Design a protein around this ligand. Structure first.
Ligand SMILES: CC(=O)N[C@@H]1[C@@H](O)[C@H](O[C@@H]2O[C@H](CO)[C@H](O)[C@H](O[C@]3(C(=O)O)C[C@H](O)[C@@H](NC(C)=O)[C@H]([C@H](O)[C@H](O)CO)O3)[C@H]2O)[C@@H](CO)O[C@H]1O
Ligand SMILES: CC(=O)N[C@@H]1[C@@H](O)[C@H](O[C@@H]2O[C@H](CO)[C@H](O)[C@H](O[C@]3(C(=O)O)C[C@H](O)[C@@H](NC(C)=O)[C@H]([C@H](O)[C@H](O)CO)O3)[C@H]2O)[C@@H](CO)O[C@H]1O
Ligand SMILES: CC(=O)N[C@@H]1[C@@H](O)[C@H](O[C@@H]2O[C@H](CO)[C@H](O)[C@H](O[C@]3(C(=O)O)C[C@H](O)[C@@H](NC(C)=O)[C@H]([C@H](O)[C@H](O)CO)O3)[C@H]2O)[C@@H](CO)O[C@H]1O
Ligand SMILES: *[C@@H]1O[C@H](CO)[C@@H](O)[C@H](O)[C@H]1NC(C)=O
Ligand SMILES: *[C@@H]1O[C@H](CO)[C@@H](O)[C@H](O)[C@H]1NC(C)=O
Ligand SMILES: *[C@@H]1O[C@H](CO)[C@@H](O)[C@H](O)[C@H]1NC(C)=O
Ligand SMILES: *[C@@H]1O[C@H](CO)[C@@H](O)[C@H](O)[C@H]1NC(C)=O
Ligand SMILES: *[C@@H]1O[C@H](CO)[C@@H](O)[C@H](O)[C@H]1NC(C)=O
Ligand SMILES: *[C@@H]1O[C@H](CO)[C@@H](O)[C@H](O)[C@H]1NC(C)=O
Ligand SMILES: *[C@@H]1O[C@H](CO)[C@@H](O)[C@H](O)[C@H]1NC(C)=O
Ligand SMILES: *[C@@H]1O[C@H](CO)[C@@H](O)[C@H](O)[C@H]1NC(C)=O
Ligand SMILES: *[C@@H]1O[C@H](CO)[C@@H](O)[C@H](O)[C@H]1NC(C)=O
Lengths: 168, 314, 314, 168, 314, 168
C-alpha cells in the first residue's frame, strides 16, 4: 500500500465522472475540474489485463464416472464421491485465495497510480511551489487556465516562472 | 493545485488478503450461477435416446429399434430409458455405458452364426412388435421340440476389422428346473467363452424371481471386446441368448443424462442434468458433476473480483 | 526529530517468497501438531461397539446382542470387534460398513418367514448364550430329520416402508459332501435371489477349511437393499441361512475406528485412530486419514506465519 | 519493499515496548521516547485481518474409504492411496506458498507503514526543516516538549514558526 | 548526476498477473521438456524382465527360469514379456503386479506337499525345456492312469515366517467334458480353499477356446496371501494345478514399464516408458503417468519465470 | 509498482554491462559510466532466492496404478483417468498462477530497487542540488571525478559544499 487513496487524501471526487484521476485547481479565473488520461488509462489497462487472465478456455473435457439414474456400486461410489469432494475443496480454496490476492493487488496498484501521478507533477513544478501535504500543491506564483493546461499536458516550464515564486 | 481520484455513491463490497467487506468502485463476478434449462446442442449431431436405454442399442429391444446403428457427437440418456424388454441386466453395465457414451455411435455387423439341430425363433410378450417378439440383435436359441436335449454346439467369430468388436451374449435363467429342461433339456448347462484376451464361463440359475414386465425369468447380459484378428468362441449347450450382430465404435462423442429439452438455438459445451452452463467464468456453483468443457465447481455462491480502486466518499 | 520502529532481542525465523530464515518480531503456527488422545464426544450420541463388529449388528452374534437396534451420531469400531461367531464373512463387506457408519443407527423389523416341512433351530457352540446358540437375526434352516431331503421352498418379502430395506442371507459351506447331505440331503443345492434391481444366485461349496472358533465350516454372508414397494424372493433348497429380520437406516452419523478412550468432557469433529484433533488451524501434520470436519493434512511439520515486521537489532 | 525498515533505518528501537512505530526526539528539555497509535494500529489491524482469513471453518465432512483393522482389496487400496497422496502433495504445496506469499506481504506492508508515517510528518513540517536522510529530521528552529507533542498529534502549524527557520 | 538501470537488445517475453508478453531482461524455464531416452539406473539393483512376465516369476514358465528368486531396487517390465506358457491368466492380475513391483524381489520356499494315489508329472509342449515341460513352481496333478478317478485329497501349509506368504494355485479348464474325465475322472470337480482371512472355492469349466501357443485348454491362476501363523488348506478333487513353492517379499522396490535401454551411466528417480526425467524443475510436460520421484505434470509446454527486471530500450 | 523503471525513467542503459543499477554523470573532466553493487546485489540476491524456492525435492514417490501393456478394467480405468486429469488441471492452474504471481513481484521489486536507490542518493545531497524530475539531479555546485566517487560510495558531505550551491 502506497498511502494515497484513503491515505493523505481523505476523500474521492464523485464529481469526477470523466476519469479515474484528475486535477482540481483554484486560481482567479473561476474554477474547473479535469481528468488525466495517461494515469486513468494505465490503471484501466492493468485491471483489464486481469480479467483477460481470469476468463480462459480449456480443451479439457471431462466425462461421467457417476450415474444419476442408476447408482453405481457403493464401494466405487464412495471412492468417487470422496475424490470429487477432495477436488471440490481444492478449487474452493484456490478460488478464494485468487480473488483475495488479486483484489489486494488491484487496490494497491490503483493507489500506486495515484502516488505515481502525484510525485511526477511535484517534479515538474520544481521549487516554484511546495507540497501542502494533503494532496494539494501551494503555488507562490499565480498560474492561469492557459498555464494550468500546460501542467496537465506536461509542458509547464520548470524554470521560466521560477525566480518570481522564489522570493515568495 | 490539487489532484485526486474518482468515487461513487454506492460501491461494491469485496474481500481481500487482509480485509473483508471493503467497498471498491466496481467489481465483477467470478462464480457462475446462471443456468440455461435446456440442452444447448447447436452444431452438434445429437441423439435423444428417450425411452431407449444406452445398453439397449446393442441388444435391441423395441424401444431401441430406431437406435441400432446410431451416430452422434452428443448422446442424451433419459430417465424413462430402458435397456430391456425381457427382464434382466448387464454384468459390468456401467463400464459398458461409459464406453458407449464416447463411442460416437455404433456400427453393426452380422457374425453369421448358423444353426442346425436346434430352434431359433424364441420370443416373448415382454418384447412386443407385431405380437410377441425378442431382442433384435440377439437370438433365443432353443431345443427343436417342446422338450428334448440341446446339442453341445460351438460357434466362433473373428474380428476381421481394424477396430475392437463389441460382442454380447445372454444367459437365460428359467423360472424353475422344470422350465429350464422344457427349453433346453435336462442336465447341468454350461456356456463357455474365450479369446486371446478373455477367459470365462457361465451356468444358468433357475428359480423364482418376482415378475417384471410380466415375467419371472431373467436374462443375464454379458460382453467382451474382440481385438483385430482375435477370435472368440462360444462353447454352449443351452440357456443361451446368441449374438446375431457385433458392434463397432464409430468415433468420438460425449454422453450426458438430462431431464430438460434440446435447444438447437444455443451452443453448449458444459452440460449437466438440469441444462447447459454457458460461461467464460473460471468457476461455477451450479452442479459439481457437470461434464464437458466446464468451469471448476466451487462451494462459494459468489466471489467478487475488484475491477476498480478503493471507494471513499466525503 | 527521529522516527523508527520496535524490535526484540530474540525474534522468529520465517520463510518468504524470496528468503528463508528471515527473523520477524512475532509469528504464529499454521500446522497443527497437538493431538488429544481421546475420542472427544461431548454432545453427541455415541456408540462404542467394543467387541461387537459393525456387520455383526445386522446378523447378531452374542457380542452384538446389545447392538441389534442401535442409534448414534457417532459410531466407534474397535480392534477387538468381530462380525462373527460361526466362522464366515461378508461379500462386499467394506461397502456395507461405509453404509452402516453413516446410517445413524439401525431399526429392525420382522420379515415374517414361516416354515413347514423343515427344521429351524440350527445352532453351534461357536455362538454361546445359555449353551449352543446362533445368530439372533438369522435362522439356520435345516432338514426335518438327521438326514433326508430339503423341499424347494420359496420365501418373499416386500418393503412396505418409505426407506430401503437392508436384506441379509447366508450360505452354509459344510465341511464335506457328507456333512452337506446330513444337513440338507444330497444333490446340487441352489439358492436363487432376485428383485426389481437385484439378480444373483448361490451354490454351497463343501470342503475342509482350517478351524476358526473351533469350526471348519464357513458361512458366506450376502446382502442387498430393497427399495420401497419392491419385493425380494428367496428360491432355495438348502445350505441356506435365512434372514429373520430386515434393517432400516435411522438417519445420519459418522463412523471411526479408534483405540483410545471416550471423553464426554471435550467436543470433537475431526477424529482419527489415536484421538481427536481440536484446532482452528487450516492444516495438520498428525494423521493423513483423519475424518470428520478436519484441517488439511500437510507433509510439513511446521509453517510459521509472520504476525509482525522485520526484526533488526542495533 | 518500500525501503525503510531495514532500509535507510539501520536499527529498531528495542526500548519501544509501547507500540510498533514512534518518535524519539532530542531538544533541550531532556529526552523522551513515544509511540504512534494510528500507525501501529492500522498495521496491527491488517495483520489481525490475515489470521481471521487463515482460521476458517468447513461444514465439509469427510468419511472413511479405507480400513485400518481390515485392509481393503489391493487394487482399490492402491487407487485410494495414490489419490490420497496426490491430494496431500497439493495441500502441502498450497500451504507452503500461502505462508511464503503472506509473509512476504506482511513484512512489506509493515515497511510500507513506516514510509507512510514518515512522509506525512515530513509534509507537516514543510520547509521549516530538512531530511537528515537516515530517518531523522534536522530542524532549524528549536521545538519544545509542548511543541513536540503538537507534531505527534498532527497539530503543528506548517507556517506559524516558519520564517524563523527560513533564515537558518 | 543521473542514475538508471541496465537493458538488453533482445529480451525475453514473460506473462504476469496483469500482462501477457512483457519482455524482461532474463528469464528461466520452469517446465521440463528434455527427456533422456534410457532407463537411468546407476547405483540401483536393476532387473530387466525382458521376455519374462512379472506374474511369471511366481509360476515359473521357461522365460522366467532365471527370475524365480530375483532381487531388485528397480524392476523393468517389457512389452515382449509374458506370464504364461500354457495359455491362461490370473484372477486379480493387476493387484498382484503392483504388489510384486514394490516387493524388492521374491524369495521362494518349499511348501512340501506330498502325493499318494495320483500322478504328478503333467507337462505340455507349450512349456519347452528339454522337451515338453511345465511351470517350474507349480505341479500338474493328475489321475494315476490314462483315465479313472481322482481321490478327494486335502493339502495344508502353515506360514512359519514373520512375513505374509504369497500362495498361488491353478484351475485347469479342459477342452471338453471328455478331456476333463480323461485327466481327472468323471463328476463335478471342486477345489475349495480357505484360511483365517480367505474364503473361496473353484470349479473347472471345460469347453472349446481358440488355440493360444497351440492349446485350447486354459489355466486360471488364483492367489491369496497367508499371514504369519495362519494356515491355508486345499480341498480338491481334480482340475487343479498345485503350488510347489510359496513366495515372500524381500523388501522394497519400484516397478516401471519401458521400451528403452538401461543406462548405468546416468542416475534417475523419475521414470516413464520412454526414458528418464532428470530435472530440478517443479513441473514437466513429458508424460502424465511418469512414476518415481517426479516433478508435477502440467499441460503447458512452457512457463518462463522472470529472473530480471523490465526491459526497455531507447 | 513503484514508478521508476519504465516510469519517470524512459530508457535503460544497454551500455551498462557492469551491473543492474549505476550512475552516469556529466561534469567537466570528461565522462564516465559506473555501476552500483549494493543495489545490484540486493536485487540479485532476491531473484536468486526465488529460484532456490522453485527448485525443490520430494521424497514423495509415486507408483503405477495403470498398465500400458495390459489395459486395466474399464470402470476402474476411467475412475483413474478421471482422477489423473482432475489433478493435472490443478497443477496446470497452480503452475500458471505461481509464475504469473512471481513475475509480477519480480518486476515490481526490481523497480522498487531503483526507487530505493534514487531517494537515498537524493537524501545525501540535501539542498545542495535539486531533482530534475527524470531520474537526473541538477547540481548548482560543480562536482568532480574525485567528488563524484564520494557520492557513489556514500561519503559525500551533506553540508561541507552546501553554502556555495545555496546562492545558486
Ligand atoms: C395355471 C395355468 O395353467 N396357467 C397357464 C399359464 O402358465 C400360461 O402362461 C404362460 O406362462 C408360462 C409359464 O408357465 C410363460 O410365462 C409363458 O410366457 C412366455 C413369454 O411370453 O415369455 C411365452 C413364450 O412363448 C415363451 N418363449 C419361449 C421361447 O419359451 C416364454 C419363455 O418360456 C419364458 O420367457 C422363459 O422363462 O414364456 C406364458 O404364456 C397361460 C397362457 O398360456 O395359460 C394358463 O393356463
Ligand atoms: C472322531 C469322532 O467320532 N469325533 C466326534 C466328533 O465328530 C464330535 O464333534 C462334533 O463334530 C462335528 C463334525 O464331525 C461338528 O463339528 C459338531 O459341531 C456342531 C456345532 O457346534 O457347530 C454341533 C451342532 O449341533 C451342529 N449344528 C447343526 C445345525 O448341524 C454344527 C453343524 O453341523 C456345523 O457347524 C456345520 O458344519 O456342528 C461337533 O459336535 C464330538 C462331539 O460330538 O464327538 C466325537 O466322538
Ligand atoms: C485327429 C487326431 O487323431 N489328432 C491327434 C491329436 O489329438 C494329437 O494331438 C494332441 O492333442 C491333444 C488333444 O486331442 C492334446 O492337445 C495333446 O497335447 C498335450 C500338451 O502338450 O499339452 C500333450 C500332453 O501330454 C498333455 N498333458 C497332460 C498332463 O495331459 C496335454 C494336456 O492333455 C492338455 O494341455 C490339457 O488340455 O496335451 C496333443 O498331443 C496328435 C499328437 O498326439 O496326434 C493326432 O493323431
Ligand atoms: C455420491 O454423491 C451423491 C451426490 O453427489 C449421492 O447422491 C450418492 O448417494 C453418493 N454415492 C454413494 C454411493 O454414496
Ligand atoms: C463494472 O465492472 C465491469 C468489469 O470491469 C465493467 O465491464 C463495467 O463497465 C463496470 N462498470 C463501470 C462503472 O464502468
Ligand atoms: C490381420 O490378419 C490379416 C490376415 O490377412 C492381415 O492381412 C492383417 O495385416 C492383420 N491385421 C493387423 C491388425 O495387423
Ligand atoms: C505473537 O503472535 C500471536 C499472533 O499474532 C499473538 O497472539 C501474540 O500476542 C504475539 N506476541 C506478542 C509479542 O504480542
Ligand atoms: C407403494 O405402494 C403402495 C400400495 O398401497 C402405495 O400406496 C404407495 O403410494 C407406494 N409408495 C410409494 C413409494 O410411492
Ligand atoms: C495404503 O496406505 C497405507 C498407509 O497410509 C498402507 O498401510 C497400506 O498398505 C496401503 N494400502 C495398500 C492396499 O497398499
Ligand atoms: C539468465 O537466467 C538464468 C537464471 O537466473 C541465469 O543463470 C543466467 O545467467 C541468466 N543470464 C544472464 C544474463 O546472466
Ligand atoms: C507364531 O506361532 C509360534 C508358535 O511357536 C510362536 O512361537 C510365535 O510367537 C508366533 N508368531 C507371531 C507372529 O506372533
Ligand atoms: C486412460 O487414459 C489413457 C491415456 O492416458 C488411455 O489410453 C486409456 O484408454 C484410458 N483408460 C480407459 C480405461 O479408458
Amino acid at each position: 500500500l502506497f498511502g494515497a487513496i484513503a491515505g493523505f487524501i481523505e476523500n474521492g471526487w464523485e464529481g469526477l465522472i470523466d476519469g479515474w484521476y484528475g486535477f482540481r485547481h483554484q486560481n482567479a479565473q473561476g474554477e474547473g475540474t479535469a481528468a488525466d488520461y495517461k494515469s486513468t488509462q494505465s490503471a484501466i489497462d492493468q485491471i483489464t489485463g486481469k480479467l483477460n487472465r481470469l476468463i480462459e478456455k480449456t480443451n479439457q473435457q471431462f466425462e461421467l464416472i457417476d450415474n444419476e439414474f442408476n447408482e453405481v456400486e457403493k464401494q466405487i461410489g464412495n471412492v468417487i464421491n470422496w475424490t470429487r469432494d477432495s477436488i471440490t475443496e481444492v478449487w474452493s480454496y484456490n478460488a478464494e485465495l485468487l480473488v483475495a490476492m488479486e483484489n489486494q493487488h488491484t487496490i494497491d496498484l490503483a493507489d500506486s497510480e495515484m502516488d505515481k501521478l502525484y510525485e511526477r507533477v511535484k517534479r515538474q513544478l520544481r521549487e516554484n511551489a511546495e507540497e501542502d501535504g494533503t494532496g494539494c500543491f501551494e503555488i507562490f506564483h499565480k498560474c492561469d487556465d492557459d498555464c494550468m493546461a500546460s501542467i496537465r499536458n506536461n509542458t509547464y516550464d520548470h524554470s521560466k516562472y521560477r525566480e518570481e515564486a522564489m522570493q515568495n | 493545485i490539487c489532484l485526486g481520484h474518482h468515487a461513487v455513491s454506492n460501491g461494491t463490497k469485496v474481500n481481500t488478503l487482509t480485509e473483508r467487506g471493503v467497498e471498491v468502485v466496481n467489481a465483477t463476478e467470478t462464480v457462475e450461477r446462471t443456468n440455461i434449462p435446456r440442452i444447448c446442442s447447436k452444431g452438434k449431431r445429437t441423439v435423444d435416446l428417450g425411452q431407449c436405454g444406452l445398453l439397449g442399442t446393442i441388444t435391441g429391444p423395441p424401444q431401441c429399434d430406431q437406435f441400432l446403428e446410431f451416430s452422434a457427437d452428443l448422446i442424451i440418456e433419459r430417465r424413462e430409458g430402458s435397456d430391456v424388454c425381457y427382464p434382466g441386466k448387464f454384468v459390468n453395465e456401467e463400464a459398458l455405458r461409459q464406453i458407449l457414451r464416447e463411442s460416437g455411435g455404433i456400427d453393426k455387423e452380422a457374425m453369421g452364426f448358423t444353426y442346425s439341430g436346434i430352434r431359433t425363433n424364441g420370443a416373448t410378450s415382454a418384447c412386443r412388435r407385431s405380437g410377441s417378439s425378442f431382442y433384435a440383435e440377439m437370438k433365443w436359441l432353443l431345443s427343436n421340440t417342446d422338450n428334448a436335449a440341446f446339442p453341445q454346439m460351438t460357434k466362433s467369430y473373428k474380428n476381421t476389422r481394424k477396430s475392437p468388436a463389441l460382442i454380447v451374449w445372454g444367459i437365460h435363467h428359467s423360472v424353475s428346473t422344470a422350465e429350464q429342461t422344457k427349453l433346453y433339456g435336462s442336465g447341468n448347462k454350461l456356456v463357455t467363452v474365450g479369446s486371446s484376451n478373455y477367459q470365462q464361463s457361465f451356468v444358468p440359475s433357475p428359480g423364482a424371481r418376482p415378475q417384471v414386465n410380466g415375467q419371472s425369468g431373467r436374462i443375464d447380459f454379458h460382453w467382451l471386446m474382440l481385438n483385430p484378428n482375435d477370435t472368440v468362441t462360444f462353447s454352449f449347450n443351452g440357456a443361451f441368448i446368441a449374438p446375431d450382430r457385433a458392434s463397432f465404435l464409430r468415433g468420438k462423442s460425449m454422453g450426458i443424462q438430462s431431464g430438460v429439452q434440446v435447444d438447437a438455438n444455443c451452443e453448449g459445451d458444459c452440460y449437466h442434468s438440469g441444462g447447459t452452463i454457458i460461461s467464460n467464468l473460471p468457476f461455477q456453483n451450479i452442479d459439481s458433476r457437470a461434464v464437458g468443457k466446464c468451469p471448476r465447481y466451487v462451494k462459494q455462491r459468489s466471489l467478487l473480483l475488484a475491477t476498480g480502486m478503493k471507494n471513499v466518499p466525503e
